[PDB]
Amino acid sequence: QQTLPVAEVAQNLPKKGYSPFGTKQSSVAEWSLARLDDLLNWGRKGSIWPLTFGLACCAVEMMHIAAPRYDMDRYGVVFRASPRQADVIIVAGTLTNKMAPALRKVYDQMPEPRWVISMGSCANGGGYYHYSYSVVRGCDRIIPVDIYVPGCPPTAEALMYGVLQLQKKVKRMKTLQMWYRK
Amino acid sequence: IIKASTGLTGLAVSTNPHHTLSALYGKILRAVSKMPQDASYRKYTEQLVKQRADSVAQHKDITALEKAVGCGQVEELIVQAENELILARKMLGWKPWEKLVQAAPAKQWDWPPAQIM
Amino acid sequence: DKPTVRQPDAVARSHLSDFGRYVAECLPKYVQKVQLTAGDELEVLIAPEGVVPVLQFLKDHHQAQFTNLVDIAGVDVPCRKNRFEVVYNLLSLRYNSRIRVKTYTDELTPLDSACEVHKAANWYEREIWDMYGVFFANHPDLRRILTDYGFEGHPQRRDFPLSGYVELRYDDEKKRVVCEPLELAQEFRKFDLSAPWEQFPNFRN
Amino acid sequence: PPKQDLPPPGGYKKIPFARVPPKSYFTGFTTIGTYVVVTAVGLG
Amino acid sequence: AVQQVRPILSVDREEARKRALNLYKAWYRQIPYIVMDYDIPMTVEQCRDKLREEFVKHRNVTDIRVIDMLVIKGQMELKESVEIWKQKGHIMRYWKESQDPKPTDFLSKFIQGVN
Amino acid sequence: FEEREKMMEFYERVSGARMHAAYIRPGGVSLDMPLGLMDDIYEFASKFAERLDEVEDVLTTNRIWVQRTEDIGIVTAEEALNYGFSGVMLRGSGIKWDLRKQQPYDAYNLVNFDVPIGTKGDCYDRYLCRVEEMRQSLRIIDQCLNQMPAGEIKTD
Amino acid sequence: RGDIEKVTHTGQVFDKEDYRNARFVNAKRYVNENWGIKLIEEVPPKECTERVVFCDGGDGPLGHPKVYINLDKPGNHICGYCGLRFVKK
Amino acid sequence: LRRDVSPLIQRIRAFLLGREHNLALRFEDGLADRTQPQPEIPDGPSHLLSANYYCQRDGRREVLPPIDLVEQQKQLAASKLPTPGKVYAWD
Amino acid sequence: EPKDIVEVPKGYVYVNNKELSMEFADITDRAASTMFFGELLRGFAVTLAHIFKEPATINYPFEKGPLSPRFRGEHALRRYPSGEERCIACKLCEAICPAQAITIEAEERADGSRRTTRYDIDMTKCIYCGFCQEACPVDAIVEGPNFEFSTETHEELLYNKEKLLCNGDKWESEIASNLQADHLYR
Ligand SMILES: CCCCCCCCCCCCCCCCCC(=O)OC[C@H](COP(=O)([O-])OCC[N+](C)(C)C)OC(=O)CCCCCCCCCCCCCCCCC
Ligand SMILES: CCCCCCCCCCCCCC
Ligand code: SF4
Ligand code: SF4
Ligand code: SF4
Ligand SMILES: [Zn+2]
């Protein structure tokens, strides 16, 4: 555990910059691949397209980032009906026994790269229906999850916190530098 | 002098409601006349449909008939008479006036059920 | 007066008492016991073989126009000889009232379907088929409605456990959602909330 | 002081619930006549 | 002892046996349409062997109401297999393809775990 | 949904959760309303009539909405009674039945409002019935803001 | 890193041979630095004159339920809710 | 005082709306204060300490098992037909 | 005025009940609105008017939405002003936790005080309902104001006793202000 720095210490530190991979990497090819990766992650963290999925009550909150108080289209985020035209599936609601192959098929038909936001307590770990017969204990055991939005109804502030943390995860996602070091 | 609409979809207005009601009431009497006299359902249905037939025969106006019966509009009275005619046809075969077909099992209608007693 | 105690309706009590005695007079064969519970609700306990005509009587009599059948509820009592009980709740719009018709059913004994009387039961008994497992004879479509397609057993039966018997996961050597025996990561902690001292002296008789 | 959450004395003014129509400017005869006049001027 | 109950679709044992044989015939006809459509890794002969094993583990019952309840449930699975009404994950549930088999000898059960 | 988010803000003000309030309990309510909720609810109910007027100016009069709703999904009243319908699907088919007026509960009989009844039974009549329930709910909200007594919030 | 081998206030630490220290190679262990025992024995005992005293947490309705402690027995009497110590001379 | 467009665009919006426009957006002047004085919830009818006993206020013990109506008529007995309630016209 | 097909009762409102007028003026009015798109132009006018409105968007995360002092968020374990932790291991909160998220194990502490040795909250089983806030007699467990606690990993959403104590230490000022401004409602 570390805390946020004091303003004198914060004035001592320099600016972080946009690039999470640093300014220089002591090679021309490494710098070129890092800047290409920065451009690619800027194009990917800008306008992730979530999927019209909406299993349950947490979905009603999902329209409160559609609703003009929070405005998910300001961030590039915009809903698409088909899973082929989507980067993100927001698994939000109760995942039951009949929806296990449905969610697995919709996730598998969605093309790479794939990031899944788990919104709500039922999608995280079953929640208030954890000890029931029909509810799958979270959506981790069927599909991978990158972001766990924790509130049962999350505030749309807390859902866009998960969306912005997904954007920061895509911003730190590195593939071309990995290709150079593989 | 005719109703424009009933304010209620699926039921159109009736051209001659009085003859339809009287025919259904006569058919209810013909179906109930085969019932035994000791059955209370026959006496109750005869009292009902005799009162309704006197209400139909006494009043010639439609809305006066609907006010005098007081149950509702006359198309719903036709619906009620048709339903009771279907019931009076069915209860001859269902045979309700006899004794209990099945006796009470032990501890069947006891609440709370888990007690020893 | 007494502001905490709920005040009942005397005229509704008198009307439901007169109608309950009227129902018990009209059908001596199928009506087994007419009772009037607290809260001004009439329960007509009937024989199983009178499941279909009595509701038909309650659909079609002039003082019994229970046009709406709002739901059918099943209660699983395992201590009785006939295990399940089936509760038909009917709403009358003409006389502005409600009635309950209660019957008893074994695990294998049929019930005659009320789909000829009320069409809402066309799914409602299906739920009682899925949750409890009583067969409804002369049903136009009797299938499991709420549970899984490969589900075995009936859930809201009290012999069935709360967490079920099986779980589902995803498996990559079969590329499929597969079925596994149930293991909770944390078990359901059962709480003993049974009352050690009785509170209501009027219900021990 | 408001020791409990209560409405002010004197009550509230009436909350509107009826649908007011928007402002209508065109009669149908006026619309057809203006269309005919505009079309004739345009053809000239 | 003796008990008078309402029957389910059959009066005696011969009609229930005829209904079970009708289930076997209908499941035999439905197996080659199950194999070509559901995308499952099971050969038609393995499917028929599994159908035979499912009938064999219910040969032991004798009560006609139990037999007819089994006939009703098998007809429900047949109706859920004529129309597709299901996925490939639930068809393979009869084979139990994910559960690793457990030993039955007491020494291996003693070594592995208390179950 | 801008106004709907204002009402979930009101829900968060009264109970602490935006959607699943856990507020109405057996024996009254859990907590008293906070101070100053009257002015916020009153300002919202003053503006919501104009918001509904704009929404009805866009949606209700249009030919495409009428052609997509009217004479479509017509349900008869005897089918509504036989299939156990309830609420707006009863009220859209001409049947005069509202449970807030016939069997009143929880002080609906000290407030006054109107019950909207459809005529044809199609989608357009049910949409107009929903908008009229919205406006009569604004009327009941006006009456409940007009009169409330001072006292306890739960049974004793 | 010393947070892996650090002991919490419940007397719990993972052994060096345990496999459960492999979960802390990517996420640091959370040990609360404010132990309640040290901060409750740092508070000096309160000297009182009356035979019985009352404790309510020091906040009124925001503390613990009000309990009465007897002070006729010599020594330090500990409130069972908040841990404050009372003494009578 | 409040953020809006200049009154030419306001008059254009009021002409295009077909009605006079009231601002949908909430402002700090129109709402109540976020910090309010600390309230006192008044006591109910039975927080008086003198007169009340629980035996006259116990609603849970005044319930009874349901009454067998045929048995009640048999014990207490030794025109229009009975309706379930008042006749309501939904037509 | 258009006539009424069915006469309305008192206290009821009939929609789609007005007969269409067959006089020449109303037929010409509806004909002009048909062929010249009158209601379409009215809807376009209303939409073009609401283009010129001010947006209701707030600049997240620089601008955050309005809330209440009663708001239910992350569970936290408070401490006394003397520094001792408030919880006395009475297991009321876990007895009332309706999804059974809390797990409490306790023993006598070395100074004799009744304290916990394990206070786990499954945050993926929580529903953020405030029953533990109402059930707590010493006001130990509260719902903190925090809701920006989305994690990348499912295990980080299973709070230990130390994580709840760190949340109680970190969020102490706002929780103290909320329980100052909220306690006479409860
Ligand atoms: C700055 C510009 C602002 C405005 C921009 C937008 C412009 C307006 C909208 C453009 C198109 C929008 C999208 C498409 C909408 C399509 C709507 C539509 O057609 O709906 C079907 C509806 C259907 O009509 P209805 O809605 O009445 O349906 C009932 C009738 N039945 C079922 C029989 C059809 O409307 C029409 O078809 C109306 C006619 C359209 C074509 C116009 C015909 C004009 C005829 C000549 C007039 C002569 C006058 C007299 C002259 C006398 C001379 C002597
Ligand atoms: C509906 C319009 C009817 C008339 C259209 C033509 C108008 C102009 C005719 C030619 C005028 C020539 C003047 C020298
Ligand atoms: S997590 Fe909560 S709000 Fe979301 S679907 Fe489950 S119960 Fe509903
Ligand atoms: S808020 Fe409710 S669900 Fe969450 S820990 Fe507390 S009691 Fe349990
Ligand atoms: S209710 Fe409060 S004091 Fe009791 S065990 Fe829970 S957190 Fe601790
Ligand atoms: Zn103390």
Spatial CA neighbour of I154 closest among A174, A145, C164: A145
DSSP conformation class of B112: S
Closest by Cα among F84, F154, F77 to F117: F77
Tokens of E114: 């208390």
Chains in touch with E (≥3 Cβ pairs < 8 A): A, C
Of the bound ligands, which one is closest to the alpha carbon of residue I72?
A: 4
Assess contact for A160 and A72: CB atoms under 8 A.
yes
Query: Could you say which residues from 5 to 44 on chain D have a Cβ atom under 8 Å away from some Cβ of chain F?
Result: 5-7, 11-12, 14-20, 22
**Quick one: which ligand is closest to G68's CA?**
6
Here the tokens at position A136 are 């799958």
The first and second tokens of residue G69, run together, are: 């402690």
The packing angle between helices I161-170 and I172-180, to 10°, is 70
User: With the C-alpha atoms ordered G41, G46, G51, G57, is the resulting torsion angle positive or negative?
Assistant: negative
Kind plus residue range of the DSSP H or E element containing D38: helix D28-43
Q: What is the DSSP string of chain G?
A: --SSS---TTS----TT-GGGGGGSSS-----S--HHHHHHSSPPEEE-SSEEEE-TTSSTTSPPPEEEE--SSSPEEPTTT--EEEE-
Query: Which chain F residues are within 8 Å of C119, Cβ to Cβ?
Result: 82-84
Q: What is the bridge-based pairing of β-strands I12-14 and F115-117?
A: parallel
Is residue H43 a contact partner of residue D4, using CB atoms and an 8 Å limit?
Answer: no
Q: In chain F, where do the E strands start and end? A: 115-117
G9 is in an annotated binding site: no
Q: Give the Cα-Cα-Cα angle A22, A27, A29 (nearest 5 degrees).
A: 100
Determine if the peptide bond prior to A113 is cis (ω within 30°): yes
Rounded to an integer, what distance in angstroms lies between the CA atom of residue B65 and that of residue B77?
10
Cα–Cα distance measured from residue C155 to residue C163, given in angstroms and rounded to the nearest whole number: 9
- DSSP secondary structure string for all residues of B42-53: HHHHHHHHHHHH
Cα–Cα distance measured from residue I97 to residue I125, given in angstroms and rounded to the nearest whole number = 10
Give me the amino acid identity at C66.
F
Query: In sequence order, what are the beta bridge partners of H71?
Result: none
Residue G84 Cα to ligand 6 middle (Å): 6
Give DSSP secondary structure letters for A45-73: HSS---B----SHHHHHHHHHHSTTT-GG
Separation of CA F44 and ligand 5 centre (Å)? 40
Amino acid letter, H89: A
> Cα-flanking dihedrals φ and ψ of residue E102, to 5°?
-105, 145
Residue A173 CA to residue I99 CA, distance in Å, equals: 36
Is E88 part of the contact surface with chain C (CB cutoff 8 Å)?
Answer: yes
Nearest to B108 among C59, C61, C80 (CB): C80
Q: Is the peptide bond before F149 cis (omega within 30 degrees of 0)?
A: no
∠ CA I108-I113-I115, rounded to 5° = 65
Angle at alpha carbon of residue A72, lines to A70 and A77, rounded to 5°: 170
Rg (CA), chain B: 20
Residue whose structure tokens are 């789609």: I16
Lookup result for tokens 């035996």:
H55
Count other Cβ atoms within 10 Å, centred on residue C111: 26
Return the SS3 of I167.
helix
Q: How far apart are CA E2 and CA B34, in angstroms?
A: 38
SS3 content of chain A, % helix, strand, coil (to 5): 40, 10, 50
The CA distance from B78 to A151, in Å, is 57
Asked if F63 contacts D28 with a C-beta cutoff of 8 angstroms, the reply is no
> Which residues, other chains included, contact C55 with Cβ-Cβ below 8 Å and sequence gap of 6+?
C66, C69, C88, C90, C101, C114, C117, C118
Q: Please tell me whether A171 is known to bind a ligand.
A: no
| DSSP class per residue in E35-90 | HHHHT-S--HHHHHHHHHHHHHTTTT---HHHHHHHHHHHHHHHHHHHS--S-HHH
Q: Which residues contact E33 (CB under 8 A, 6 or more apart)?
A: E82
Method used for this model?
A: cryo-EM
Lining ligand 1 with CB less than 6 A are D 32, 35-36; F 63; I 34-35, 37, 40, 44
- Alpha-carbon Rg for chain F, nearest whole angstrom, is 18
In angstroms, what CA-CA distances link F33 with F10, F11, F13, F18, F23? 10, 10, 8, 15, 11
CA torsion angle I19 I24 I26 I29 (round to 10): 150
Q: Judging by beta carbons within 10 Å of its beta carbon (0-12, 13-18, 19+), is residue A97 exposed, middle or buried?
A: buried
Residue among G8, G36, G65 minimizing CB distance to I84 = G36
Q: Which two tokens stand for residue I119?
A: 């206070």
CB C30 within 8 A of CB B91: no
| Helix, strand, coil percentages for chain I (3-state, nearest 5) | 30, 15, 50
- Output the six-digit token pair for C58: 């309650």
Does C63 sit within 8 Å of B48, measured CB to CB?
yes
State phi, psi for I103 to the nearest 5 degrees: -130, 120
Instruction: Kindly state if the Cβ of I132 falls inside 6 Å of ligand 4.
Output: yes
**Ligand 3, closest atom to CA A151?**
1
Q: For residue C44, which of C59, C54, C29 has the smallest C-alpha distance? A: C54
**CA of residue I36 to ligand 1 center, whole Å:** 5
Instruction: Identify the bridge partners of residue A101 per DSSP, sorted by sequence position.
Output: none
HSE-CB of I9 using CA atoms within 13 angstroms: 14
CA nearest to I55 within chain A: A68
Q: At I95, which helix (H) or strand (E)?
A: helix I92-96
CA angle E69, E70, E73 (to 5 degrees): 85
C-alpha span between I141 and I135 (Å, rounded) = 9
**At which residue do the structure tokens 């009844």 appear?**
F117
Q: How far is Cα B75 from Cα B66, in angstroms, rounded to an integer? A: 10
Q: Are G61 and I138 in contact (CB under 8 A)?
A: no
Helices I38-51, I24-35: inter-axial angle, 10-degree rounding:
60
Residue with tokens 């062997």: E49
Pairing of strands I75-77, I141-143: antiparallel
- Residue A158 token pair: 């807390």
Q: Is the peptide bond before C140 cis (omega within 30 degrees of 0)?
A: no
Candidate from D35, D38, D41, D43 with most ligand 2 atoms within 8 A of CB, to mutate: D43
Helix or strand run (H / E) with residue B90: helix B74-94
Q: How far is CA G89 from the centre of its chain?
A: 25
Question: CA nearest F128: which of F114, F118, F141, F140?
Answer: F118
Report the distance separating Cα C89 and Cα F2, nearest Å. Answer: 40
Chains that touch F (3 or more CB pairs under 8 A): A, B, C, D, H, I
- Residue that has been written with the tokens 């009037």 in this structure: C36
Q: Residue C86, Cα to own-chain centre: how many angstroms? A: 4
How many Cβ atoms sit within 10 Å of the Cβ of residue F92? 32
| C180/E93 Cα distance (integer angstroms) | 9
**Nearest residue in C to B93, CA atom:** C53
User: Pairing between strand A147-149 and C68-76?
Assistant: unpaired
> Could you give phi then psi for residue C170, rounded to 5 degrees?
-110, 135
Rounded to whole angstroms, the Cα distance separating F85 from F92 reads: 11
Would you say A70 and A154 are in contact if contact means Cβ atoms under 8 Å apart?
Answer: no
Q: Are E79 and C149 in contact (CB under 8 A)?
A: no
Cα–Cα nearest to A95, from C154, C148, C151? C148
| 3-state class (DSSP) for residue F7 | helix
Q: Name G64's Cβ contacts closer than 8 Å, sequence gap at least 6.
A: G55, G56, G57, G79, G81, G82, I86, I88, I137, I138
Residues written for chain F: 156
Q: Are F95 and F119 in contact (CB under 8 A)?
A: no
Q: Which two tokens stand for residue F26?
A: 């057996």
Pick among C6, C33, C35 to test the H interface (most H CBs inside 10 A): C35
b/e map B16-45, b = 16+ CB within 10 Å: ebbebbbebbebbeebbeebeeebebbebb
How many A from CA of I158 to the centre of ligand 4?
A: 13
Enumerate chain B positions whose Cβ falls within 8 A of a Cβ in F.
Answer: 5-11, 79
What per-residue string of b and e applies to I12-49 under the rule 16 or more CB within 10 Å gives b?
A: ebbbbbeeeeeeeeeeebeebbeeeebbeebbebbeeb
Sign of CA dihedral H59, H60, H64, H66: positive
Please report, for chain E, how many H helices and E strands are present, in that order.
Answer: 5, 0
I36/H65 Cα distance (integer angstroms):
72
Nearest by CB to A141, from C160, C161, C169: name it.
C169
Contacts of C137 (CB under 8 A, 6+ apart): C110, C111, C112, C113, E8
What is the DSSP pairing of strand C97-105 with strand C111-112? unpaired
How many whole angstroms from its chain centre is CA A70?
17
> Is the distance from CB of I164 to CB of I121 less than 8 angstroms?
yes
Q: Give residue F58's identity as a one-letter amino acid code.
A: V
B85 by DSSP, 3-state: which?
helix
Neighbours of C94 (CB within 10 A): 23
Say how far apart CA E40 and CA E51 lie, in whole Å.
15
Give CA C97 to chain center in angstroms.
19
**Ligand 4 in contact with I144 (CB < 6 A)?**
no
Residues with CB under 6 A from ligand 3: A 56-58, 93-94, 120-122, 127-128, 152-153; I 127
The two structure tokens encoding residue A15: 């600016």
Name every residue whose Cβ is closer than 8 Å to that of residue F52 and which is 6 or more positions away in sequence: D19, F131, F134, F135
Which amino acid type is present at position C28?
Answer: P
Question: Are C53 and B109 an interchain contact pair (Cβ–Cβ within 8 Å)?
Answer: no
I149–A148: do the CB atoms touch at under 8 Å?
Answer: no
Judge whether A182 is annotated as a binding position. Answer: yes
Compute, in degrees rounded to 10, the torsion defined by CA atoms F83, F89, F94, F95.
Answer: 60
Q: Are G32 and I165 in contact (CB under 8 A)?
A: yes
